[PDB]
Amino acid sequence: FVNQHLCGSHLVEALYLVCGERGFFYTPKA
Amino acid sequence: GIVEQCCASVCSLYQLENYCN
Numbered sequence: 001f002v003n004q005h006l007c008g009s010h011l012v013e014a015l016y017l018v019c020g021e022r023g024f025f026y027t028p029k030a
Numbered sequence: 031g032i033v034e035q036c037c038a039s040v041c042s043l044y045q046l047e048n049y050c051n
């Protein structure tokens with residue numbers, strides 16, 4: 001489900017799901 | 031950054047995993 005254009009909450013939900021308990025960092029600007 | 035790579039273009043598992051802690 002990751003091989004598409006993922007924007008906004010959509011992208012964050014993909015990080016959330018794939019990263020699991022590791023967590024992630026979301027830096028839209030850098 | 032991830033916007034350019036995953037929003038402006040098609041994302042990949044590889045790219046997303048780059049942002050996992």
Ligand code: NA
Nearest residue numbers: 035039040041
């Ligand atoms: Na891309």
